[PDB]
Ligand binder design. Sequence first.
Ligand SMILES: Nc1nc2c(ncn2[C@@H]2O[C@H](COP(=O)(O)OP(=O)(O)O)[C@@H](O)[C@H]2O)c(=O)[nH]1
Ligand SMILES: [Mg+2]
Length: 181
Amino acid sequence: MQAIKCVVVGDGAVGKTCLLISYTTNAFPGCYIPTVFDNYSANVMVDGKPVNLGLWDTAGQECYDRLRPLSYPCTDVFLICFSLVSPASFENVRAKWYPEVRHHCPNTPIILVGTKLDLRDDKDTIEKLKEKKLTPITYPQGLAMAKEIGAVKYLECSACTQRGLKTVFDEAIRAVLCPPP
Ligand SMILES: Nc1nc2c(ncn2[C@@H]2O[C@H](COP(=O)(O)OP(=O)(O)O)[C@@H](O)[C@H]2O)c(=O)[nH]1
Ligand SMILES: [Mg+2]
């Protein structure tokens, strides 16, 4: 029936691959590639609506700044990801990922995703940031960024515990099925 293309962007090490693997397949060996004959699209059904959600991961490296935008054509929604325990990835949304997604696709919906939510309350992770004079991204800080980039939604998730993870992909679909003109 309905086809929705979703592209995930954001810094290396923020959890983009793990977010996709954890949502589609659980377990370390699940780590799938598009070459898998089983399928690439996802079988999702919401409020009686049959949606085939195609998921695309991205090489976040500076080297592939020329090759990564080739997957941007015909994207219905973007997930812009930053790690909630990395302030550098957060400011890379401001300086790189939002300008890049907007330059190539001016009218496509953006969902801002705060990743690694489980590590925001982690005592060791918090101490290690504090040593470098850094702190985790709070819900007000992430919501503030979402407003600055005019994102359709701000969501926080963990791929590791699966907290809020399913909600991210459900909202990606709702951004396309219930837009604003
Ligand atoms: N605690 C924790 N670690 C995570 C989560 N997601 C990814 N990671 C870890 O973060 C690192 C980067 O993950 P990956 O998905 O490859 O990053 P990508 O470069 O953005 O794709 C790996 O060491 C993962 O195990 C998470 O939700 N919680
Ligand atoms: Mg990756």
